[PDB]
Amino acid sequence: ASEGPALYEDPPDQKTSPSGKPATLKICSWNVDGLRAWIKKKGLDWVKEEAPDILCLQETKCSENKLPAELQELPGLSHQYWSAPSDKEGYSGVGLLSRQAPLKVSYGIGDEEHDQEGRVIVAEFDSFVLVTAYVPNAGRGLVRLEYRQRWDEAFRKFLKGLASRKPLVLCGDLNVAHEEIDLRNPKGNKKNAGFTPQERQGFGELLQAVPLADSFRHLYPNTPYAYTFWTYMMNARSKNVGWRLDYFLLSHSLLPALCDSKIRSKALGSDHCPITLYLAL
């Protein structure tokens, strides 16, 4: 490869808003790459250290009926909701674990075509709606890119609907590095899943249509080498050859409440690292 190590030190946790209000809500999002594999790699021990109010998980690869028992040993996240593929098999899948029960939990995006792979959970709270998503990969050889574009449109229109009623927080694996700054090797990936012009545009359209703001990039518009994903292959993580695929996207009305948007680079357990959002609601 042409890449060597590129340093990134995630700055300190800013736990107060620009107005001086302390953070009241702490959300953590993490593509676990297999719930049971993740647990075996002591992912839960890190959740305990982070002590989030809400935990959102993607790629659980686990049915709602076959959760591992250790999730019961998770103290302050007793309200747990799961969505998995309708075929009841072990792939994709998302989860949402919360300190308090949402006003309402929904699954999918109200479109039968896009709701069969357990990719979305909607949790409505008093002052905002939380959506966690595992966006369909464009696929090897981009064989699923045409569907991904259909997904992008439907998902975008769905979120616009939600945001019309309450402020929206979208988090999870959106499977795209928006800009060149969001991955280590933009040049060699323009025709690969996660950095096709199609996918990058879909992200821009998402920000515009709903509308939503990239919380991390809002606070750190010029910070390079901040990634949330590295291939297991090729010693990529140690060299920091990665992609920023995991986001917290906020309604514009929530920006005054934005305290910080973190990337927990050193937390192991998956090929993705956790991200954490501080909000002063």
CATH of residue 132: 3.60.10.10
Residue 79 annotated as part of some ligand binding site: no
Q: How far apart are the first and last CA of the chain?
A: 45
Q: For residue 87, indicate whether it is catalytic.
A: no
The C-alpha atoms of residue 47 and residue 74 are separated, in whole angstroms, by 9
Which residues contact residue 45 at a Cβ distance below 8 angstroms, ignoring those fewer than 6 apart? none
Distance, C-alpha 209 to centroid of its chain: 19
The C-alpha atoms of residue 199 and residue 176 are separated, in whole angstroms, by 6
The 10 Å Cβ neighbour count of residue 153 is 15
Which residues contact residue 10 at a Cβ distance below 8 angstroms, ignoring those fewer than 6 apart? 226, 262, 263, 264, 265
Identity of the amino acid at 86? S
The C-alpha atoms of residue 257 and residue 168 are separated, in whole angstroms, by 12
Residue 45 annotated as part of some ligand binding site: no
Structure tokens at 74: 């998770």
From 10, 33, 173, 260, the catalytic residue: 173
Q: For residue 178, indicate whether it is catalytic.
A: no
Structural domains counted in the chain: 1
Residue 173 annotated as part of some ligand binding site: yes
Q: Which long-range contacts (CB under 8 A, 24 or more apart) does 219-223 make?
A: 219/258, 219/260, 219/261, 220/11, 222/181, 223/181
CA-closest candidate to residue 104, choices 129, 139, 87, 136: 129
Burial of 215 (0-12, 13-18, 19+ CB in 10 A): buried
From 107, 182, 272, 278, the catalytic residue: 272
Backbone angles phi, psi at 160, to 5 degrees: -60, -40
The C-alpha atoms of residue 10 and residue 155 are separated, in whole angstroms, by 30
The C-alpha atoms of residue 56 and residue 7 are separated, in whole angstroms, by 27
Q: For residue 218, indicate whether it is catalytic.
A: no
This entry's atomic model was obtained through X-ray
The 10 Å Cβ neighbour count of residue 73 is 8
Would you list the DSSP string of 71-108?
A: GGG-TT--EEEEE-BTT--SSS-EEEEESS--SEEEES
Contact 30, 173 (CB under 8 A): no
Residues spanned by the domain of 262 = 1-281
Residue 13 annotated as part of some ligand binding site: no
The C-alpha atoms of residue 83 and residue 271 are separated, in whole angstroms, by 21
Strand order in the sheet with 54-58: 79-83, 94-98, 54-58, 25-31, 275-279, 258-263
